Design a protein. Structure first.
Ligand SMILES: O=C1O[C@H]([C@@H](O)CO)C(O)=C1O
Ligand SMILES: O=C1O[C@H]([C@@H](O)CO)C(O)=C1O
Ligand SMILES: O=C1O[C@H]([C@@H](O)CO)C(O)=C1O
Ligand SMILES: O=C1O[C@H]([C@@H](O)CO)C(O)=C1O
Ligand SMILES: O=C1O[C@H]([C@@H](O)CO)C(O)=C1O
Ligand code: NA
Ligand code: NA
Ligand code: NA
Ligand code: NA
Ligand code: NA
Ligand code: NA
Ligand code: NA
Ligand code: NA
Length: 207
């Protein structure tokens, strides 16, 4: 599957793509404002994520740090990124269908649109100004708006028992972005697409 990753932000981002225990395609790349990076994701990839990272520094070996979404210090990510991260999530070729969503379960750093470029389903979007509106106790100094699980590490926020409800904090993310997961047991906002669809992830879509 083809994913075109487009940075419409005014600022540089470092895109990342992983399934948790491996890179997808090269795993990461710099995108200056306006740049597009096209990757290939293997069919059948389960549990893939794409995200942006902000305020990164890398040396010539591709090691360094980002203020949001750092993945073990690597330019090419192999693992998931440090919150806060707005997440484009996908599982491809699962019994004939693809499943896409946007999540704020790991917080929010950059606004996002995640849409198919082929026919048969609709896209999803979280483009509200979550960072500017973020509750004081969730604000990350690095940039971004942390989820409550990251901040407080409770069973209720992290839904560790598989028993949890919405919270004051999850409802904030839900109010600003109804079409994204706000907590682990949120009513799903997953979209079912035809198997082997292709996609575009746009950072800062309203920019
Ligand atoms: O880091 C980058 O890589 C590409 C190009 O320079 C070679 O792939 C690009 O446009 C970036 O900002
Ligand atoms: O116009 C500009 O381009 C770069 C950056 O935004 C590219 O992403 C920068 O720092 C500017 O002031
Ligand atoms: O893969 C996972 O992603 C979400 C969350 O961590 C980010 O949305 C979750 O609950 C998983 O088990
Ligand atoms: O495995 C996942 O779990 C959550 C959600 O679907 C249920 O918590 C999510 O965002 C994932 O990628
Ligand atoms: O039937 C198919 O659709 C996709 C692609 O063509 C996008 O539509 C693909 O890889 C197929 O085999
Ligand atoms: Na891949
Ligand atoms: Na295939
Ligand atoms: Na992101
Ligand atoms: Na990183
Ligand atoms: Na507030
Ligand atoms: Na199909
Ligand atoms: Na298909
Ligand atoms: Na936007």
């Amino acid at each position: 599957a083809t994913f075109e990753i487009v940075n419409r932000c005014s600022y540089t981002v470092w895109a990342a793509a992983s399934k948790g225990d491996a890179a997808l395609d090269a795993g990461g790349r710099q995108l200056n404002s306006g740049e597009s990076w096209t990757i290939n994701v293997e069919p059948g990839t389960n549990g893939g994520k794409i995200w942006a990272r902000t305020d990164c520094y890398f040396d010539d070996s591709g090691s360094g740090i980002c203020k949001t979404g750092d993945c073990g210090g690597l330019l090419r990510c192999k693992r998931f990124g440090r919150p806060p991260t707005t997440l484009a999530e996908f599982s491809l070729n699962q019994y004939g269908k693809d499943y896409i969503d946007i999540s704020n379960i790991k917080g929010f750093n950059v606004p996002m649109n995640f849409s198919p470029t082929t026919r048969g389903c609709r896209g999803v979007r979280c483009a509200a100004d979550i960072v500017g509106q973020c509750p004081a106790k969730l604000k990350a100094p690095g940039g971004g708006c942390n989820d409550a699980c990251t901040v407080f590490q409770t069973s209720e926020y992290c839904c560790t028992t598989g028993k949890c409800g919405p919270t004051e904090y999850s409802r904030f993310f839900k109010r600003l972005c109804p079409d994204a997961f706000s907590y682990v047991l949120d009513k799903p906002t997953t979209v079912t697409c035809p198997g082997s669809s292709n996609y575009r992830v746009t950072f800062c879509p309203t920019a």
